[PDB]
Amino acid sequence: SNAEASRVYEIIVESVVNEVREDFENAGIDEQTLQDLKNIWQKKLTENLMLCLYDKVTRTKARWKCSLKDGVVTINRNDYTFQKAQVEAEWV
């Protein structure tokens, strides 16, 4: 559970709708169609994978350290958002 993820999701929905509204008016479809994109999108929004970027990956003998920045992690049906991360893994 996290309210920051819901706030980020709301900023993403509002910003995407507001920035896409221009391309929706250029195509000439409908504004209520974009409203249906927001309603269906938020309706659909209601396997342990980390997505981010690395800054430095060092290895010493069999010890791996990684510096990660800005990413979302899916762990045990729970989502997380981090600005920094440190990975200290050991290889056989």
Binding site: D23, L51, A89
Partner: protein
């Protein structure tokens, strides 16, 4: 610019299923969904770059590692994650690209 790996997340797959739902079930114009995907990549990039304050800590046994086309891919078994709570993970996959 703006990598397309964030599309593989939960919200990314949700937006992909929503766009494919609007294109398949209805008559929503195509190609525009790709523009929604690019705007999605930019918004997730800048949002995760500016609206994040957490700091994780993963410590486990490195099962697999690889690097290709500025892509680091790791597979860790039995790793503990510390948020800023401790979470036990049996298998964790990490995919990262170059930040520069």
């Amino acid at each position: 610019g703006y990598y397309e790996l964030y599309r593989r997340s939960t919200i990314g797959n949700s937006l992909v299923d929503a766009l494919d739902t609007l294109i398949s079930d209805g008559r929503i114009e195509a190609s525009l969904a790709m523009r929604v995907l690019e705007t999605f990549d930019k918004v997730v990039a800048e949002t995760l770059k500016d609206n994040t304050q957490s700091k994780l800590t993963v410590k486990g046994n490195l099962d697999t590692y690889g690097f290709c086309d500025d892509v680091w891919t790791f597979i860790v078994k039995n790793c503990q994650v510390t948020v800023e709570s401790v979470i036990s993970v049996d298998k964790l996959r990490i995919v990262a690209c170059n930040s520069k």
